[PDB]
Amino acid sequence: ANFLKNLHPLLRRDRNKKDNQDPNFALIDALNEEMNQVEKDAIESKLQSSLKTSTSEYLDKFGDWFGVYRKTDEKDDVYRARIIKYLLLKRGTNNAIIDAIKDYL
Amino acid sequence: SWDEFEKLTEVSAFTNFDGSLKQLMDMVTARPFNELFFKNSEKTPGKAQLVLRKTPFNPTEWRALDMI
Amino acid sequence: MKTRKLTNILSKLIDKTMAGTSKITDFTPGSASRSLLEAVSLEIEQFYILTKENIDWGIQEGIIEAFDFQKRQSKRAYGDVTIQFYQPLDMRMYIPAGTTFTSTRQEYPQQFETLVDYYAEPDSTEIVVEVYCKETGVAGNVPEGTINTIASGSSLIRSVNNEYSFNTGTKEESQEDFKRRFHSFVESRGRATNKSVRYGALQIPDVEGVYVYEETGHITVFAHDRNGNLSDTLKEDIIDALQDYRPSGIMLDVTGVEKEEVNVSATVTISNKSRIGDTLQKHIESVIRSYLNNLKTSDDLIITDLIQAIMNIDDVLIYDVSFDNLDENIIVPPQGIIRAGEIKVELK
Amino acid sequence: KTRKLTNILSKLIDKTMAGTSKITDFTPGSASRSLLEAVSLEIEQFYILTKENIDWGIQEGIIEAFDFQKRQSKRAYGDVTIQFYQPLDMRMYIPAGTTFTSTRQEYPQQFETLVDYYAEPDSTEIVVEVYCKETGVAGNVPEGTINTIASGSSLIRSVNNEYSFNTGTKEESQEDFKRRFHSFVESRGRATNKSVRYGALQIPDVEGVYVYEETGHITVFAHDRNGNLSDTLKEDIIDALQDYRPSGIMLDVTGVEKEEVNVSATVTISNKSRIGDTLQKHIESVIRSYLNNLKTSDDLIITDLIQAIMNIDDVLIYDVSFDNLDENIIVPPQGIIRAGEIKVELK
Amino acid sequence: RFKKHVVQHEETMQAIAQRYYGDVSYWIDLVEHNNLKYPYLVETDEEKMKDPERLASTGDTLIIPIESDLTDVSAKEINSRDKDVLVELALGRDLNITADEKYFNEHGTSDNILAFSTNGNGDLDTVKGIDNMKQQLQARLLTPRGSLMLHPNYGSDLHNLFGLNIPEQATLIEMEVLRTLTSDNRVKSANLIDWKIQGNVYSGQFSVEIKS
Amino acid sequence: NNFIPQPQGLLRFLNTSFVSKFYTPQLQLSELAKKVLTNIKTDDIPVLEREFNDNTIIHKANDTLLKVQAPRMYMILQSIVLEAYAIVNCFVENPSSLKYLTEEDVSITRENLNYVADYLGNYDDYNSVVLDLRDLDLCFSAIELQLPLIKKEA
Secondary structure: OOOOOOOOOOEOOOOOOOOOOOHHHHHHHHHHHHHHHHHHHHHHHHHHOOOOOOOOHHHHHHHHHHOOOOOOOOOHHHHHHHHHHHHOOOOOOHHHHHHHHHHHO | OOOOOOOOOOOOOOOOOOOOHHHHHHHHHOOOOEEEEEEEOOOOOOOEEEEEEEOOOOHHHHHHOOOO | OOOOOHHHHHHHHHHHHOOOOOOOOOOOOOOHHHHHHHHHHHHHHHHHHHHHHHHHHHHHHHHHHHHOOOOOOOEEEEEEEEEEEOOOOOOOOEEOOOOEEEOOOOOOOOEEEOOOOEEOOOOOOEEEEEEEEEEEOHHHOOOOOOOOEOOOOOOOEEEEEOOOOOOOOEOOOOHHHHHHHHHHHHHOOOOOOHHHHHHHHHOOOOOOEEEEEEOOOOEEEEEEOOOOOOOHHHHHHHHHHOOOOOOOOOOEEEOOOEEEEEOOEEEEEEOOOOOOOHHHHHHHHHHHHHHHHOOOOOOOOOHHHHHHHHOOOOOOOEEEEEEOOOOOOOOOOOOEEEEEOOOEEEOO | OOOOHHHHHHHHHHHHHHHOOOOOOOOOOOHHHHHHHHHHHHHHHHHHHHHHHHHHHHHHHHHHOOOOOOOOOOOOEEEEEEEEOOOOOOOOEEOOOOEEEOOOOOOOOEEEOOOOEEOOOOOOEEEEEEEEOOOOHHHOOOOOOOOOOOOOOOOEEEEEOOOOOOOOOOOOOHHHHHHHHHHHHHHOOOOOHHHHHHHHHHOOOOOOOEEEOOOOOEEEEOOOEOOEOOHHHHHHHHHHOOOOOOOOOOEEEOOOOOEEEEEEEEEEEOOHHHOOHHHHHHHHHHHHHHHHOOOOOOOEOHHHHHHHHHOOOOOOEEEEEEOOOOOOEOOOOOOOEEEEEEEEEEO | OEEEEEOOOOOOHHHHHHHHHOOHHHHHHHHHHHOOOOOOOEOOHHHHHOOOOOOOEOOOEEEEEOHHHHOOHHHHHHHHHOOOHHHHHHHOEEEOOEOOHHHHOOOOOOOOOEEOOEOOOOOEOEEEOHHHHHHHHHHHHHOEOOOOOOOOOOOEOHHHHOOOOOHHHHHHHHHHHHHHHHOOOOEEEEEEEEEEEEOOEEEEEEEEEEOO | OOOOOEOHHHHHHHHOOOOOOOOOOOOOOOHHHHHHHHHHHOOOOOEOOOOOOOOOHHHHHHHOOHHHHOHHHHHHHHHHHHHHHHHHHHHHOOHHHOOOOOHHHHHHHHHHHHHHHHHHHOOOOOHHHHHHHHHHHHHHHHHHHHHHHHHHHO
16 A cells, blocks of 8 residues: 555656645655554554564453453563463362462462 | 234134135235235345335335335 | 544644645644545544454454354243143143243233143143243343233133243343453363363353352252253253363262342432432332342342442432341352342332 | 515406496506506515515514624725825726735735725825625734735825724624523523522632522632632622622622541452552542542532442452441531542452 | 626616516515615615625626526525625535646646645635636546546546547547547537647647536 | 433433643533423433443443543533434424524534543543544534524525
């Protein structure tokens, strides 16, 4: 998606070198910059759309979905590992219960 | 159809002696209060549809019909 | 990717536009450029909002797809009815499944049908059978004594009535309910645990309330539907489907339910001295009945929770609420369930 | 009521036939028929004139007696003067419709002259009235903007308007006209709670005024100025309410006091793993915001507080209790609830 | 639509109504369109000086709506106050993109030519009235047929019609221009008025019957 | 009210620092809202015994904490709904309520609608509410242009 492309045939898509000031070029540049920023934000959402790289509010939503609650002053890297470990919790056997003491130490 | 004005019914299958389903269909329709006809399915092209709706002579129902 | 209001985006775009020239700085409401920029910013804000909503929906869909824990669809309403004969029965009659039941009341035209056959014993006078509502949703929760006729010949039947209301009829589960169910499922992966047995018994869609009581060498399971009446077929289905979560070395039993009764008396001081008639009292009593009947075996009656439930009405109308009898929280036994009995409500 | 051309013409023809025996022909083009038709047309025009007059009378005529002005979308106009290089030696002609374009490019407004003007034989200057083409407030122009004339001449030097165009007018609907009259009539009410409130609110720096009424004395208090009331404001507002108070009934004005509330509540959460500093801080902020936003003379009902605190999340909160709050706190009419010290404990 | 009319000397509103609408009885509703007081037509100029806005005199422009729109209350309300603005609204309003009128003529069938401009102060220039119609016609003629990204079949094949400057090519160009001009439903029709080909430059002119 | 009942929840809801550079709010109540609000406050109005359509904007406002977090902003939302509710009623039924609303009263609603929209946009919780009100922002402007013209027609 490019604002310069597919806009119109007759519209002047380049600034006039005859005069420094050009409201048309300024408007086109501002619109293109806004739409390019929107495109970059949309592309940047790929990391936020996956649990392996979700951060900030998205990771909190993932934790709420999985039921694992964020601890105070907890960073994303440790929080994701804690979520993964809790989802694969090993408990029920005497050795596993004893091995679970590491989380209660 | 007019659910509010119509009470519970006990329409029998054999109301017409050795009659067709169309004859029994007419009794259920209770014309002219309800219109029944076969027409092409505009919403789903490629197949037919059976229509059984209240008569369009009502003001709001008249507006509901698509205009051509 | 973060939410941004329209005004900030519009200001940023206007600031960017002003670079390189000074023949544009006029943004009154009558200006068309301002209108175009407002429309563009509105579209961008709507795009951001829809993107966030679709991201949340995609997260939900991925959670659905990964563990195959699909959301529960609309749940059929069902209950029990009583068949009354003119005279005591002489011969063993037959009642095939699918027999229709209809309510003569115009306000509740929804139909009901049976699924399992029933046989009337000889020298009988009455029999109880189960009926399942064809429609699914709120329409199935008819009041008491709504079903009047069988909608058939009824040669040997005088009248039909139901002594209990229908509560199993419910709409589709909300997002919060699915989130809680998924959290229970995630915490239930470790078998031989009470939280795991909770999900194991709750996996059947019909079950709503469920509780597990443990002792030194025996495990007991208490469960019931929204109406609060366990069935043998439900117990058999639970036993069949729970084999993948039962403890290996400990016996399990699924039985036990009792309706605990309590009378609730409350005093309400409405802010408006006018309009203190019995209609609002009846409405409040119905609301209290709906709240109390919604509780389950795991839940316990709490004074503050009841206060919050009744005070859902706007605080401007109801200014103060107090209980003459209830002064301390009541602990429900594990087998029993607390529910409304005979409720009396008065102004003062 | 008004009658159309046909009825009047038929009545005239019938009366002419009844009275006149010498006239029998009424074909089109007849002199008598043309005369009767002209008379009927004039009568119908007079009927329409009376109809329009009655329409104006019902719409705004009765209200015109009271003190208010009507607007009829009159286009802006003002005096403009023109100067010449030398005194004239001829009677120059200024035909109507001459366009006085605006010299400033940013102003697209234009003006036209309705009536012709004749320059004097030797006058060096002349002032004429010019009306704008566009109605509404948009026709207003600042001073020193009209300095160009379309019908230029060698003798003409420049144009200028010393006085700005103030006669710009815009017309509103009948409801807008009637609402001001209703407000004026309503404002004339006196010796009532609502009238006293409106009179107090008329003076600036008067907001959130509360009135307490009794058979013995009437007390009025407010926190208009930054949550506090000054003595000078009390002195100013006592005199103003003299016209508004009932005759023979005492009037009193006092300040507004506050009663801070200390609460140490406890909350039990179903899922203890969710607790944290942020959650308790948010709960405390919600509680203090709710307690701060209390109306004047509003009793602190514990039931309302329980409903507010437990409405944050039904699933999260399971039980609530207050360690240092026995029952609902009653406040005088002049008191207002405020958050002195709040503590929340998580169980 | 509405036909323009000028008040004639010693003329009455009844004759004005009768000339166009045929029946004089329609004059009762026609006055509301013009938004005039009871002195509908007055020869005295100083009489109009008291309230020029709500009065008319000789030489002023009147509005004559068609019979279908005569009875519409909305048409009466709009024509009462807009007056001269009706023509601009009737022909529409659009942004003006003729920043360089001298330049765009030098590059026919060339992209990246038109651009926005500025008039007044701090606002993009706009065009209205017959100027807007002429600008739209010129843009349509310059725009090739199958270049726009939406609502295709907009423009002309003028770029492809360059040839050996022979009479048949000239008639083909004439027909293409006529079809391009007549595409808009607002314009009635068009016809060539003069042809002139000398050397390697094609020249000509056309006349268009614009409604109202 | 005269023709059909209304939901219980809407009836309960209706009866009852930060500043935007572009917009300047004001608390001028419409004349129509003054009289219609009294009828809602009084009991003389039919009302249903059940509620549906949980996706409406009213339930969204109730679910969020806008009441306690920003009661001033919550009050403006009630005012917007009050004027919005009344102008729906007159067209469908009771045409006598006409010639009691002016373009100025409808115009100020957009000023308040945009003023509260900016505050709601500072947090992601109110995204659903902001998505709804922005749709009505263009809806009122169409009524403002046609309201003087519709009044003369009727």
